[PDB]
Design a protein around this ligand. Structure first.
Ligand SMILES: NC(=O)c1ccc[n+]([C@@H]2O[C@H](COP(=O)([O-])OP(=O)(O)OC[C@H]3O[C@@H](n4cnc5c(N)ncnc54)[C@H](O)[C@@H]3O)[C@@H](O)[C@H]2O)c1
Ligand SMILES: [Mg+2]
Ligand SMILES: [Mg+2]
Ligand SMILES: [Mg+2]
Ligand SMILES: [Mg+2]
Ligand code: NA
Ligand code: NA
Ligand code: NA
Ligand code: NA
Lengths: 494, 494, 494, 494
């Protein structure tokens, strides 16, 4: 059951979070964050820049000093603290879900039942990892005792996007804190509010000052300051490919900090002719339109086998037409607005391109309301591989349907991409399922499902969709620095 | 025993190795490689460049295609092929040890008993890993079966330095081939010969064409072409910090290939007053002077507790004065020449630097012979933390001895460095050992020993000494791309 | 701080727990449980036998059926329930600590600060494992996909002793429940009360009926019924070597159920001449006297190097004399009574044997009070390896101090035992600690400490002290049945 | 190709193997081993008894002493020695195959291409494990460093059966030796010869004296001596359920040695109506008839969906009717004789019972030759779950075919067995494959294949088919004893 939202939740936190305290920017500058449903300013937010990052990194560095409360704390107690954070987030769930919706635009029902659930499950999962990521004892040649310590990497810069503000925060904080790192987080200018409120809960949970610092602000300013910082040990970036490149170059040009990236995709969703029709149609709809189409791994190339194409297309158009666009706080609403005017206008431009390049417009194609950034659920049929809308990440409610004949054809066409974040296969055949799931060059392959995230199972890109993995045990790798200790012993025995 | 060397081994391979075949550069250009003991040209070698790299990468890509012999091959069979390569290397051990000495300058006894031994152990270790690096089955929420595939990362560019030509080749090839990758290797222009001979053995072992491709040539040409290549999935680099940066920048500016790095160090070797004096002196000598000082993890800061400083220095100077410099094919020789003229001059520069900034010249400090690139074993005493010779990698037979009072003091001074590749502690005390091994910010901490490498134990840098780890199970992480497969099932049960 | 105890806590649960309900024994029989401080009956408890075990196993089996709530439950939710259970135990901590003291005899301060803390930590540790114990994907030869499912073993019979009633229940429930198993637990007749109260909390926590079943009763009846049962898949037993044998025999004679055992010990505690004297003496006191001497891994052979023997003994005797025996509810009490009259009499008999065989009685030797099962802290000096008190587990406040000369000697003497549960080494020397910890034939070796249990570190016997390990990741092995699934695929690729 | 066999290979080894030397039985008694194809004696073999076992155990215990060659040997070198043993077995492959066939009865082509191949692959697989089975470093609470040593279990008794003499030896020796254990092996009285020759190869490979000891002889004599021995640390037994009980009982009644068992099966092979008919018929035939039906995990309940029952049965009969029985040395022979007269008679007895209990005899059912233990490939139709031949392991060329309607029905019928060694599923449907592999209570589930063994994938029984797993990483668990070392440190940091 979903509790009634406060459709205008109060903002308590809108500043820079350093040493468990709230600070204005050194410059005293602020920036507006907008409600995408109305285009109205919610409030002002402190505009962190390089000087503010510097304060945060110093705070983080001090928290990480040998002998500090956070360094000496039992690993099991890091788990306790993550679990306490989860509880606090659960206590403030109704509030946080409404705040998420206000700033981001996604339906409140979804914020509550999906985002907040996943946030809670991610943190509780990683709480369990805190005291279980063992190093090794190693049967080295000669008279030595050799072992590894799994130590934290240190000061971790974490730059996150706007599409799942709370969940992305949890994805980054969970594994970092489980392994005893400290954090300087740069949240998206489009959606700083919920992450800032969680910083209040981080302090309430009992985390030592400087363990988590949050600098709201812009990319080329606050973001780049972190990526280029001489005392940040590790950077994790989620967002556009373009800025992914900027991050890796910044790391190379500065102190050679360790780097992981989660970037976009143009993920293919493959519907074989022996698929369950109703299930396939609904899941393809979900795969594309989920979160206003603002999902890294959106199924934005829907490949359909020729024998079922006409039927699949018909049922897909009908479903897009029935999809309820409106006020995210209304319980009927399935699709809220796009995050901002920039994305709003980029999506419309993609639709213009789709039309002019000869794809068949089957429904939508225009603005869904005269207020806020609402776009009609749009479906293009007879899409070809060379078309812009088949190549570029649109990040909106714009569906691409492409026809194919053979299993070998679809494999090569799905893989003919410099992206490789995810892929999906809809089929009842065992061999086809296994053939495709092996042959597909993607970080995740869903079979008869889509967008199934589990804190237990890793996620990340092939090719230019990123590097490294998040979630599961693998999510701990990039947050661990490995030390070998090799000790001379009187006489080594098995 | 050691078999008598051929002091003038014949060169059989001096071209570019692609698809198991020997090729001239497209340009037909060649470059001389020099014997550092005599300063004379050994032979000419094909000068690979961008167009040659492109050929090598295309061949590697072809060998990596789905359904190729190398992709279809049983994992256990990759292990078989690695064990065979090792057998052939051992067959040619005496020849290869001489050729290594000729091209590189290190003592033949060392080439034979150390380098070649470690090459064999590395390959045989990784052979064993071929069919054991499991993925996971994962108890994900909901009605799903979730698992991961550990796939190869793909086309792997490997750019290696000159200080351990054969050993670096093996450190790179072992884990890459064990996990089913394909390789484009750029060997050092100073030392191309031994690795080109190994390529012949790679063909003899039965490796499919395109699996290993070797392009000798220079850095800004051949190496930069690998680093910037749009179809190289992963690059591994070992060398200078300067070029490390370039590599990471080129990776970021191109296709976001995955990057691991092994760079310099200024590793602290800490001698507590309770250490075994005779042992610590001899091991501190080895820690610095091993391989003409040309070791990434050389113990180039010798911190000695004040109570034993005077005696420690006296004994170190006598040991350095006794160290035999000469023809590396002569069995009495402890120390051969530096690798080339560039390094020779660089080291002479650092020696003069040390004298100018007021470090106490205790022995050596000059050119050791007329022909070749021989330098006297040199010891500086009363070295201070702020001195350039205390901060910068010298990569020559130049020893720094520093004085400290307390264990807390020495931790801070050892850690005060942008480098963090290795460290060592000499002590009889349980608590001192554990306190320091924990506190030292280094990839490897040796206790009462130095330069102890096991194929089983990982090695790599903290901070600007690099990122990632080689050797052990950890050496397989960077050579693996992870894929999650999540499958809808009728009813998930435990 | 420690909350004031209720010295007469009320009993709410004293029946058989099956399907989340309380039941009398089918025979309607009850047995008294006694307060060992007074010798007086606390209450009657339902006396379970074969008929009751049969009901419990059937409930367990039904709860374990494919498609049941417990089988379908997300592994992450099993973790939620374990965490909920821990929260509930924490809510009732002061009550549970007082009931533990009432029934067992251990000091309330210790029940509260140690046992209850460890219980909480054990369950919260295993909660985190629930969704993390991955199976494998395996690169088998040929055109196959091969993986392992880690399934629960099934119906687990758990027979637990009286010395740490709540803690042993947690050691058993944590791993078994985290892995999705179902339990029939036979608690000790001396200490059934606290475990029965926890069953109320298991129900309250929301564990499906039949998942945990608890049958109080005697050993030859209820316990043997579990061991011999044709539908119990796995038995874990903790107690005497003698009953350990009965268990393994019963399992081989019935259905070949899987068996793990934790049995007695005669663990050596080795004090080298370079040990810290004050610390060594205090820790050797703790090592022996902890929990009224009633600890499986009690340090019951104190080997002291001859040069420090005289002083060590003198201080140990002083410490044993100052040790406060009395009412376990009084804050000053260090030592409570022994658990029952049988143990009481057995210990006094072992004291007699010590006097008879010519060990030097240095303090204690008799009863400490005229009411309750209290025994004086007793120290024997000059113990010899052949004496009964040096060979057999006494399980009481009786300390054996033995003299040795060399490290080689003490290794042989320490390992000359059919037991091998634990051992310790007290020394400042790095090499001695490494030499000894390698050489000692024991499941746990402590260095400069004793009785350091962590939920993270495994615990278990060598030789006749048992088999298999509890705690840590290893504690899940016995609760897992492994299934290989091997699937034909069109064409296997790496 | 397959090299021509020597049809009367010479026996070089027929004694007891202790300390790398050949010994007569203390009693000087011998027993004959018979060629099952002719019924004639091959040679006499030393008849080992209790006293011979005592000698062997003492040799093994001496080899296992701390500081011995076997104990001090580098883990990597144990690997080298396993690899050398494999090389020697391959050298002698053609002879061993012929000798295997002479003593066992299986076709020479199978001996050469299957058994010998698998032996080589198993030994080489485990050679790679030797230096890779790491212990753990553990982030325990408090100021402690805690780690685990993976030490060998010790003296391992290994009692093996007669169906895969050479393969079972490798399955036991591979993991035991990889982890540094020592072995007392008791080979089957029916097939002692090939194992004794391998012992000669174990000496040639360089294994220290006492590391592997082999005692030929009878079960209630030599086998029981091993199971009851006070100085054997671990027993592994493969054979009947009946003796499996005896082994577990003896372990319990003696020194509480660790026990793993691999016992019988009545494995279900389930053919869904959507299976590939031609493939399933052939694989069902293989599943049952392989190795003269003498396979632990034989597909001895063939469940066939009603819609395809008639055709499947017809095709099965045609294949059984044309299966070539004859001289195992003839290239065309698919099926040799049963191993001995006792087996011969028991199988014919089961054929009688099958007829008597109302199963439809469709082909075969009698003796195939007038000398040797040759039985006609026999197929029973319309088998019911209640029939003896549906319940008991026949271990011969006797196929049972049962009819089913629904997937839910077949699950209950398959699992209604005290056995659970293996199962198979033949279907083209994704969901049915996943539904069944999860639901079936068996240690291995094959999908669209059968008898797919890989050194990489674990094998072992559920229920009364045994406990523990052989092969893969899992096969090392039983050969490892875990030691925790927990060290007090001045100040624990992450
Ligand atoms: N699953 C298998 O791998 C397997 C193997 C062989 C036999 N079997 C089953 O057992 C039946 C009879 O065969 P079997 O009698 O040759 O097998 P078995 O179980 O009696 O003997 C197997 C091994 O154990 C030894 N052994 C026999 N009695 C022993 C005892 N009392 N104590 C210790 N060791 C003892 C034997 O010498 C042999 O080495 C067959 O029909 C078959 O069903 C199963
Ligand atoms: Mg941008
Ligand atoms: Mg350079
Ligand atoms: Mg008893
Ligand atoms: Mg028998
Ligand atoms: Na906003
Ligand atoms: Na050279
Ligand atoms: Na009691
Ligand atoms: Na025989």
């Amino acid at each position: 059951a979903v509790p009634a939202p406060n459709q205008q939740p109060e903002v308590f936190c809108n500043q820079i979070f350093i040493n468990n305290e709230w600070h204005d920017a050194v410059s005293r500058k602020t920036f507006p964050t907008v409600n995408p449903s109305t285009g109205e300013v919610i409030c002002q937010v402190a505009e962190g820049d390089k000087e503010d990052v510097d304060k945060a990194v110093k705070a983080a560095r001090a928290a990480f000093q040998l002998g500090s409360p956070w360094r000496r704390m039992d690993a099991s107690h890091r788990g306790r603290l993550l679990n306490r954070l989860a509880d606090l987030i659960e206590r403030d769930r109704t509030y946080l879900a409404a705040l998420e919706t206000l700033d981001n635009g996604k339906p409140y029902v979804i914020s509550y039942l999906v985002d907040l659930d996943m946030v809670l499950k991610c943190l509780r999962y990683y709480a369990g990892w805190a005291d279980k990521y063992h190093g090794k004892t190693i049967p080295i040649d000669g008279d030595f005792f050799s072992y590894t310590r799994h130590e934290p990497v240190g000061v971790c810069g974490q730059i996150i996007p706007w599409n799942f503000p709370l969940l992305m925060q949890a994805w980054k904080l969970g594994p970092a804190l489980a392994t005893g790192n400290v954090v300087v987080m740069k949240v998206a200018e489009q959606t700083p509010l919920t992450a800032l409120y969680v910083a209040n809960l981080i302090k309430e949970a009992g985390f030592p000052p400087g363990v988590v610092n949050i600098v709201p602000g812009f990319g080329p300013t606050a973001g780049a300051a972190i990526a280029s910082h001489e005392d940040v040990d590790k950077v994790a970036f989620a967002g556009s490919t373009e800025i992914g490149r900027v991050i890796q170059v910044a790391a190379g040009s500065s102190n050679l900090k360790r780097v992981t990236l989660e970037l976009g995709g143009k993920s293919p969703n493959i519907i074989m002719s022996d698929a369950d029709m109703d299930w396939a149609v609904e899941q393809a709809h979900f795969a594309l339109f989920f979160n206003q189409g603002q999902c890294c791994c959106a199924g934005s190339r829907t490949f359909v086998q020729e024998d079922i194409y006409d039927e699949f297309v018909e049922r897909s158009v009908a479903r897009a037409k029935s999809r309820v666009v409106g006020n995210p706080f209304d319980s009927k609403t399935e699709q809220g607005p796009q995050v901002d005017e920039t994305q709003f206008k980029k999506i419309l431009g993609y639709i213009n391109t789709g039309k002019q390049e000869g794809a068949k417009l089957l429904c939508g194609g225009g603005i869904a309301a005269d207020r806020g950034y609402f776009i009609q659920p749009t479906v293009f049929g007879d899409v070809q591989d060379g078309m812009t809308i088949a190549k570029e990440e649109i990040f909106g409610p714009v569906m691409q349907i492409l026809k194919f004949k053979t299993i070998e054809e679809v494999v090569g066409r799905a893989n003919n991409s410099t992206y490789g974040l995810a892929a999906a296969v809809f089929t009842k055949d065992l061999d086809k399922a296994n053939y495709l799931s092996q042959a597909l060059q993607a970080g995740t392959v869903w079979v008869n499902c889509y967008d199934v995230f589990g804190a237990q199972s890793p996620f990340g890109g092939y090719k230019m969709s990123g590097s490294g993995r998040e979630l599961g045990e693998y999510g701990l790798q990039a947050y661990t620095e490995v030390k070998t200790v090799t000790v001379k012993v009187p006489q080594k025995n098995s």
